[PDB]
Design a binder for this molecule. Sequence first.
Ligand SMILES: CCCCC/C=C(\C/C=C\CCCCCCCC(=O)O)[N+](=O)[O-]
Lengths: 257, 16
Amino acid sequence: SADLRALAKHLYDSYIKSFPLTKAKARAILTGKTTDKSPFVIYDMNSLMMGEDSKEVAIRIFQGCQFRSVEAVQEITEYAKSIPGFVNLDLNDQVTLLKYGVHEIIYTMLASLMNKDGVLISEGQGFMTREFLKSLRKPFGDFMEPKFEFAVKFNALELDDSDLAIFIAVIILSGDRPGLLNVKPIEDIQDNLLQALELQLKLNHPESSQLFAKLLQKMTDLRQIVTEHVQLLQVIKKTETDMSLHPLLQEIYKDLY
Amino acid sequence: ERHKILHRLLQEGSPS
Ligand SMILES: CCCCC/C=C(\C/C=C\CCCCCCCC(=O)O)[N+](=O)[O-]
């Protein structure tokens, strides 16, 4: 139990190190409680352009998002390495866990940056409106909506970084990823992680009953989003011609249901 | 297959 508490603390601490923008910080900015200036608002084309602190509209946003999606994968890999037992695993299984886990964690943590009307960008320096991202052509104006939809559902659980540190370790340590060689040692780690999450939720949220259950239910909603996001990529395969995909994102998306 | 960069992230850490 002191084991369970110390594992919560350690996860929390590396979470702080790995991820430059926490939910606390995002929340303080989003609710106007900050002091730390106020983000530049992007609600259209001209505001996108003045928001400066190469090609076509929706493509520009697409490519931008790619630099930060790469960076997010780097951050999450850093963080995964900190999960006790992770770097003790077979090297191919480590890759698999990341390969399949990273999207689910991006979506989860992207909620932290969202309200129903928009999203923080440039680590809190910017605010891009939901309606604007929706105004992009083709398959591009349909990428964010199911994220906002999920963020509204997920944010009502009212988790803080302490909770989230553990939840994302749980997601990474999923023994049910395809092509995994040694399932057992992954599931023994996750078992342990679920016990720390369960105790963490009880103590930090003593009045919000069955939160544990409800959080775990969100794992079906995360995986539908992943499913959807990939089908939208497959539309950018044919519909769009010259569209540089980043090598890291390529190997992430190569052979993934 | 192979996953050059992931292997390399797991091994070298980031970037600066
Ligand atoms: C500046 C780009 C605006 C896009 C939405 C805001 C973001 C995006 C951050 C990470 C990208 C989230 C997209 C989900 C997975 C990306 C993989 C892909 O590029 O298809 N943000 O961090 O604030």
